[PDB]
């Protein structure tokens, strides 16, 4: 279990949990076509640039830790 990225333990901080589920969410957006479509329709940006910003939000999400 420990070697699966996204797994948690007793000393897991809230920041680790939510950066985990945030990266998971971004990759899920990358996967499911109609999700990336909904997002690329909401904000008037092409699919390519939406994917690019989703990749930039991979080490950025929730900002730096404490």
Partner 1 sequence: VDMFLYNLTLQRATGISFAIHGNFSGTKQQEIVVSRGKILELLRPDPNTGKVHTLLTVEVFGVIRSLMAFRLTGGTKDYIVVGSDSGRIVILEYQPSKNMFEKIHQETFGKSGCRRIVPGQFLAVDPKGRAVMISAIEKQKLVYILNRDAAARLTISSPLEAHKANTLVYHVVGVDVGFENPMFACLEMDYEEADNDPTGEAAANTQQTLTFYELDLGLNHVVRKYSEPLEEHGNFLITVPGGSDGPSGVLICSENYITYKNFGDQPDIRCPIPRRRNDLDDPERGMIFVCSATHKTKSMFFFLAQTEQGDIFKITLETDEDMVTEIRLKYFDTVPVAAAMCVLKTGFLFVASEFGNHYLYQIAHLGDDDEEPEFSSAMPLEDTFFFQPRPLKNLVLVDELDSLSPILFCQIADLANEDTPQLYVACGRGPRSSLRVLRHGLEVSEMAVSELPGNPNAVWTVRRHIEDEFDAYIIVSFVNATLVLSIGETVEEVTDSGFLGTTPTLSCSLLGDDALVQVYPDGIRHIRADKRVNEWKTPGKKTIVKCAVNQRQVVIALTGGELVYFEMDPSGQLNEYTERKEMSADVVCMSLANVPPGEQRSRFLAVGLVDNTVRIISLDPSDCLQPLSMQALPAQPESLCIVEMFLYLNIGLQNGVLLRTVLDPVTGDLSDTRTGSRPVKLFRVRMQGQEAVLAMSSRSWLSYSYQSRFHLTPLSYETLEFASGFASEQCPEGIVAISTNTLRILALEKLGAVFNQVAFPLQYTPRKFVIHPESNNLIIIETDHNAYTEATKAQRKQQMAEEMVEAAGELAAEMAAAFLNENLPESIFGAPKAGNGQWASVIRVMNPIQGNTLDLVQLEQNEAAFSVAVCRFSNTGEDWYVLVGVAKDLILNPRSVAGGFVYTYKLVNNGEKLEFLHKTPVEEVPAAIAPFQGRVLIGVGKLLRVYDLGKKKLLRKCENKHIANYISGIQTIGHRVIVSDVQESFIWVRYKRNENQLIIFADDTYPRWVTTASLLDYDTVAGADKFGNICVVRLPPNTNDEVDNGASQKAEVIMNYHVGETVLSLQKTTLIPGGSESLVYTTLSGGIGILVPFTSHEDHDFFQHVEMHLRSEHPPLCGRDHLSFRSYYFPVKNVIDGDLCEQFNSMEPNKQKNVSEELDRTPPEVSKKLEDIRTRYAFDYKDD
Distance of closest approach, residue 1 Cβ to partner 1, in angstroms: 14
Distance of closest approach, residue 10 Cβ to partner 1, in angstroms: 19
The beta-strand segments (E) located in the chain are none
**Residue 17 or residue 56: which is nearer to partner 1 going by CB?**
56
Which of 7, 52, 59, 60 minimizes the C-alpha distance to 30? 52
Beta-carbon contacts of residue 52 (< 8 Å; ≥ 6 apart): none
8 Å CB contact between 57 and 49: no
- With binding defined as CB under 8 A, does residue 17 bind partner 1? no
- With binding defined as CB under 8 A, does residue 18 bind partner 1? no
**Residues 24-53 close enough to bind partner 1 by CB under 8 A:** 24, 27-28, 30-35, 37-38, 40-49, 51-52
């Amino acid at each position: 279990q420990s070697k699966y990225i996204g797994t948690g333990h007793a000393d897991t901080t809230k920041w680790e949990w939510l950066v985990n589920q945030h990266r998971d969410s971004y990759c899920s957006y990358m996967g499911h076509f109609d999700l990336l479509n909904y997002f690329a329709i909401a904000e008037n940006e092409s699919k390519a640039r939406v994917r690019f910003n989703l990749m930039e939000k991979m080490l950025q999400p929730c900002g730096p830790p404490a």
